[model samples]
Target: EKVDNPFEGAKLYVNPVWSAKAAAEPGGSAVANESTAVWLDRIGAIEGNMGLRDHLEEAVRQSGGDPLTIQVVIYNLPGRDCAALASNGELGPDELDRYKSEYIDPIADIMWDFADYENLRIVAIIEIDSLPNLVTNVGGNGGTELCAYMKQNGGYVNGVGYALRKLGEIPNVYNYIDAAHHGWIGWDSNFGPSVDIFYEAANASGSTVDYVHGFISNTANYSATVEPYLDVNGTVNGQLIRQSKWVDWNQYVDELSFVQDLRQALIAKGFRSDIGMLIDTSRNGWGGPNRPTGPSSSTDLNTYVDESRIDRRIHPGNWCNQAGAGLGERPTVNPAPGVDAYVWVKPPGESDGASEEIPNDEGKGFDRMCDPTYQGNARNGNNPSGALPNAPISGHWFSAQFRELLANAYPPL
Candidate 1:
């Protein structure tokens, strides 16, 4: 009865909206048949043009009575995207009530109504970039005033716990918490405490770790799923590879390795043993003429990592519309032992954020990482942001990126 892995033998609902967009691109038909997530990031989105109910109904119509799972991102926590301005949500840090009554409650109710749809299963990716911000961005580690406020106010923790409990009540819903990417919490200082922090949220709002289906990594970020030529334990010239700037002494180097180890650590912390991990393979392909064919021959630590690594971000911490990103692995269930699925939770061609401030009603702020011309920062190793220019606001499609991703798809379109 414990399907442990929900994606097993499951038919997924393909969004016609995203499919049409993908198909419109040159050679994009290769992946147009694929299913990507529908992100309900704000209260307005719950009823706006891409309304949740409309999407589910469309999926149900497409199912033809066969069972189908449609993955939707449950974002919009109070003070969301704390560490960054882009996607900082419509709710204020202290708007916990609005977050509850207006946000999470309404979203949960819609899913509950779908309980009658035996043919429909909803995979809710709850609150991307909300929890991990408390650990990495609230302290001396690239800490920001906004992140500090979110941690001190107890909003992220309370909101996540409430989301778990409310959404968990729906028999057909599977809730996957966003654990952020390996680059954000892979270090010793952030890893253990990251699990502990997750446990705190899991236990809040009358919730237990029992409600958590699993954790997902790299929800909408660019981080390689695996580095074929490099190992976290690899060494060059008697110096550990992690010592290089690329890895920056992080314990895990890629999403695949980081998730397997993190899953075990969660069980050690008392989460259900069956909780599975998901990685966003939407844009971390990192392939093209520049992709390395094999390990680098250099004996120098920096040189070794710089030459052989596949993730081409200027800095591992950089998260935005990266310059040379490519499409990654197509969605697959149980691709590995603990990994539940590799998904496109963040649809390709959708800009991460704008290159410059464009005033809007959505709470998204101008994040420098989205501006290609912006100078360095401690988070990005004081390097160029590496974002593409002329981008529109986040969530709006950018044609140039789609073209690039298609041109440089990892498996090569």
Candidate 2:
């Protein structure tokens, strides 16, 4: 018996810009362009924009509905992604004031204005890869000068807190803090600290935990949905759950479990019992010919191949545009216990980042994952996963990848 949700009747707004990009791709599924929004609609949801004022007004107009439901992603954090290079953002370590005046405040004003619409529901996904990177990568030899600087400058928490306090004032707005995927913070060493980080940010923002609706996981990253060796009891070959040898230990089980625990943790820390969870199911489908059956014998390393996991990465940390990946479960509300929705937060066909360095209109530099011929990075154990070559900037469309995703869709679109 699922409880009724306030957002159940909400209409999800789709970004026409993304839709147009999908439609323009050659040789891809005719439906590929519309697939994300369309698929989301089927499951009773939808998902866009940037800047501060212009973008929100345009979004509201484009949506063309009173009390509209709009999804916005906040990305521009100072010293963003302190550990990685491929998807690093534009702001530098010393730019906190600029972030407040030039970035966050304007957005906050727009949100406050729109919030007056008693019918509006604004879902803001705040600062992807920002706080999480601070937790896992900052301090000592963990990362760059930016990491140390972010730590000194409140470690991105103040900015997130400020956003929450400003936007949370609007009764109609729901804000979800971005929790990095299962692979990054799923372990015992990382889980408790991650929860604390969220708590501290909530407190520091001068807003109670009530300001945060919940957490979002697996944003713009690929982690598997299941671990094949585990049974319903989460045991394999006499090893229980996390103890199993076949467990990559960072798949969807890891994600769901983390959410459930985090939910309890939040409540213990004074958050509401209704604190929800959302997963980015846009690209972790691990279907097609690559989809694995049950483990073969379960005794050898080969038995734990790519097919056995929800993620198809040759290396678990490979964040480049993946090869042989497909769309995962469709968007849906309250899909599981303690979960709020499974969303296509990352639009399909968008590049993760360039695999190799190439001059591009998009400001991001090339990473090793973009080059098909280049060997893998140290993060991925130097083992190539055969990704598509010549990928554009992170959010740009790649038609070939789109076709591959649709062709390999799990439920067969």
Candidate 3:
């Protein structure tokens, strides 16, 4: 008998913005646009049911690879308290039931398609707040308000639980908990504690949380923690940001400090004894409305100060290159004893913000994942430099960084 090869496979994962509502809209822009769409296509098979006829899967096969595993990180569960979709009025127990019946089932159906493909698997990154723990600290009305919300839509709510219980309903469904510091509670408050609680929840609920995602600045620490806990060791790692901050490249101590500070914190916390790292070559730096310092002079690039007061372009591309190369001057953590693969969690080319102001493009903004205005010509969009947006709505820097990583991390397999 011939032994089956487990390594002969690929896994792809993506999180839709808001919900499938935007994607399902006929002419409305969907999550996988020019930047992200192209980036994902550049990586592996687009293995989900959102819309199979699209170019993703074909891209993988064309590249001499097989489409095997995929996980669609869905968002916008009813009753969740996000800036984008907060249930209005009051959230009660009944709303929790509604969320499960209405949203979860359809999502499972979508998963069926992903799993139907020869090696494809489907999973979710459900969003929720840290109840009792977070709300209780805020006291009375705050606690009541948050608790009520969770009761109706928390990941532990009947709705999410119902979806989990019927895991068999979908072919290769699994779950990943998003332990992002910036989301549920500020990292200042819930770094180590949150991970502990989340692990307990997954254990109690019998949820097979294959991975734990740490978005924003939290990636450094969270990856450090979870890397050592899993069997695959370092392979259970997470993403790392390339660049993001208000300081000009001439004064990027904070940006560099973020890397340095995280490394120190992780060491003190024994990260080397915990998780591996999954670097996200996508969006390396930070950009947003009313950034602490100010937006970069132009989306094209900025200059930040290094250790010797030397300023560097800190272009989007360079951000990715440095982080991916582990040359950011931070200590590197090893994945368990044997694991070696450290994947990029962020899909490249997803737009950060619309570029209507600085570059005078009407459709550019920070949260381009769900923006519809520029969706029309996203495929061929370009930054001020006239380079095709790197990924789906990506800038030249994002793609450049990816290419650099490919060259440095591995040379043509």
Candidate 4:
């Protein structure tokens, strides 16, 4: 009898900074979206330092097996543009402009870095407002500054009138918009608007590209645990109610439906689904009630996210390894004809909950994964409960568990 090994036809990519942990400071910087200079220094050293590149390359090669695909997250947005949008803070016109000048061009150069490695291709995490900036800038003839680019191409004019100028430019680079499952900013904007923006951007870009795939997990703030709600003060009950066996099918349906609508909208505007949707599999697929837990919805929540009614599932693993056992099989979503490749977009090692809680803490060691609080000991006096704490500012760090996860996700290939 054939064993049901689903990972067979999949392709995996490890986050060079997060997974390899090669030549990085405390909080990982390779994929940082705030400090470009700091990251650039590290990047230059990595490129110049063959020893460092080999260290990182080996990690990706091992996780991916032979000719590996490496997805590096570059987050150094000059001026720390995302820092200003703290907690649902919208980007004002001026701040938006600063982003283009300080952030976009820098990122464009970063994208070109992929050209250096023969076996590596990066799915740049053009997150926060960066995603929207992509849609607008490319359309507005690469606006004067990031914010102005967004404004002329896709800024909110009273919470409407979004544009897709950036999407038009995606063909020139590789990128993926970061989509959050739950968060003040993520939920407030609603899936509808986000989808529209991507659709519009792709159409306006004047490129043949169609869909712009992204991710949506359990929270606006990142978390790997399958629990319906995030744990606060050790209060699992206090966690947000995960409605479905796999956090709420409604949420998935809503997001996916919106994605479909966005695809349709793009076609309406004369575009296609060149970029397909990619769900972050990092902290999903197991521990749900469906297993021995019997009728206990929690166990099923895990498998549900990894495998359920959803047709296109891409398991990226968790912020750290502790969230789930390890990464699952290859991405099930295939990129359409005009689209780019569909693979594990979220590199296993990128820090998620770590950066939010305790800015630069190394995290409570790798074993913290098994703890009820997926993000290590919750610091007191760091701030009020529910508010992310203020630890020394450092880059994000991926734990050992994350590496184990990559091992599981990427079989010999």
Best by lDDT: 1
Clashing pairs in 2: 224-310, 224-311, 355-369, 355-370, 355-371, 356-370
How accurate locally is residue 228 in candidate 3, as Cα lDDT from 0 to 100?
A: 14
The lDDT per prediction is 0.87, 0.65, 0.31, 0.34
Report backbone clashes per prediction.
0, 6, 47, 53
Best by TM-score: 1
C-alpha lDDT of residue 383 in model 3: 14
lDDT of 2 by residue, 204-238 (tens): 75877878887888776666544454342444455
| Model 1, residue pairs in steric clash | none
Runs in model 3 deviating more than 4 A are: 1-67, 81-94, 113-118, 128-148, 151-171, 181-189, 200-279, 285-347, 352-413
TM-score of 1: 0.97
Please give each candidate's TM-score.
Answer: 0.97, 0.84, 0.42, 0.46
User: lDDT of model 3 at residue 65?
Assistant: 42
Q: Give the TM-score of candidate 3.
A: 0.42
Which digits, one per residue and each the tens of the lDDT, describe model 3 over residues 1-413? Answer: 00021112443433343113223433323223311221211101223333432433443343344543333333333444322112221233336555555455555554555454555433333443322233323334224444454543444433333544444345444443333422223234444454444444433333432232221222221112221111211111131112322121211122222333333343354333222222222232221221124222222222221211111222211111122321111111222232212223334332232222234232322433223233322111211111223333322223343433233221121
lDDT of 4 by residue, 1-413 (tens): 11111122323443334334522433433222211111221223335433234434553465444433334343423222221222222234435354444444444444444345534333444443344433333333323354454445343321111112232143322344444443211232344555565444444424223323333223112233233322211212334234432233233332333344444544555443243444444334333222122222344444433333221122211222233344433344343322233334444344433333343232222222222343222111111122122211223445554443334332211
Rank by TM-score, descending? 1, 2, 4, 3
> RMSDs, each prediction?
1.4, 5.2, 13.5, 11.9
Consecutive 10-residue window with the lowest summed lDDT within model 1: 1-10
